[PDB]
Design a protein around this ligand. Structure first.
Ligand SMILES: O=C(N[C@@H]1CCNC1)c1cc(-c2ccc(NS(=O)(=O)c3cccc(Cl)c3Cl)cc2)nc2n[nH]cc12
Length: 271
């Protein structure tokens, strides 16, 4: 019987919902419709045996928690249901995005990362699997840790080199992940990618970054800096979000209009 902070609805019980599909799994996430205002929600059920109030984590590009409740064995978090689907589902259809499109997504991710870092939070696991698109076309991040081999293929790796060789990591890992997510939007594959897992990990940890010729010098400088193996030399080490915010690549971004959703998304998902 954990107090669950102030987001607690002492009246809510799982009986108040209709659980359609299990949309995420590990502790899983479900799609459910409320039996009042017939509104669609995403409910994250965890399960007690998995042993920090917070939940004032409100950002335009992060999932919102409406309320939370508990049974006496399962833990439920009623979150916003995001309609537009994964961002990299759209990347698969097109192979790669143009720089204006990628700039918009990396700008929305950078401001959400900067906000998390101001709350002393580290995403650590920023994967395309966790980057969704709302019905209007804006970035909304999920799985930012608020609550919890193979020879070939192997699930793509976005973790910074220091995380891979179990070393002290900080907010700078998120700036590596931003560079990896951005590299993929531009080139079509995750950085250092190989079908051979041993080869891919060897690239990530010991091989210099291979930036191919068809991106602007601005994007190239940003990826070079964001994808720095040494966390002390990486973009974001000195003054976090402020270095990203001012970079040549984000010249066209008015950061105020960006957070106030006054910039039209470069694509609207048909929903
Ligand atoms: O479709 C989703 N996930 C699929 C599984 C991987 N590919 C996509 C999805 C997940 C969550 C979701 C996932 C993880 C979390 N994680 S959490 O720790 O960061 C968190 C954030 C904010 C408040 C709270 Cl209480 C929590 Cl626990 C929260 C929401 N929300 C959603 N809304 N609509 C869709 C949602």
């Amino acid at each position: 019987q954990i107090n669950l902070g102030p987001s607690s609805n002492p009246h809510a019980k799982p009986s108040d919902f209709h659980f359609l599909k299990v949309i995420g799994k590990g502790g899983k996430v479900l799609l459910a419709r409320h039996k009042a205002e017939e509104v669609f929600y995403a409910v994250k059920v965890l399960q007690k045996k998995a042993i920090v109030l917070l939940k004032n984590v409100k950002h335009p590009f992060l999932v919102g928690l409406h309320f939370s409740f508990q049974t006496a064995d399962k833990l439920y978090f009623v979150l916003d249901y995001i309609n537009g689907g994964e961002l990299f589902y759209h990347l698969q259809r097109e192979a790669c995005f143009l720089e204006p499109r990628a700039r918009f997504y990396a700008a929305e991710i950078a401001s959400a990362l900067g906000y998390l870092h101001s709350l002393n939070i580290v995403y650590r696991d920023l994967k395309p699997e966790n980057i969704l698109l709302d019905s209007q076309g804006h970035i909304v991040l999920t799985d930012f840790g608020l609550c919890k081999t193979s020879t070939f293929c192997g699930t793509p790796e976005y973790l910074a080199p220091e995380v891979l060789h179990k070393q002290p990591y900080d907010r700078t890992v998120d700036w590596w992940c931003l560079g990896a997510v951005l590299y993929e939007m531009l080139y079509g594959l995750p950085p250092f990618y190989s079908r051979n897992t041993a080869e891919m990990y060897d690239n990530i940890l010991n091989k210099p970054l291979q930036l191919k010729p068809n991106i602007t010098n601005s994007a190239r400088h940003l990826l070079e800096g964001l994808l720095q193996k040494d966390r002390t030399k990486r973009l974001g080490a000195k003054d976090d979000f402020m270095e990203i915010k001012s970079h040549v690549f984000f010249s066209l971004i008015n950061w105020d209009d960006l957070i106030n959703k006054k910039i039209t998304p470069p694509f609207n998902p048909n929903v």
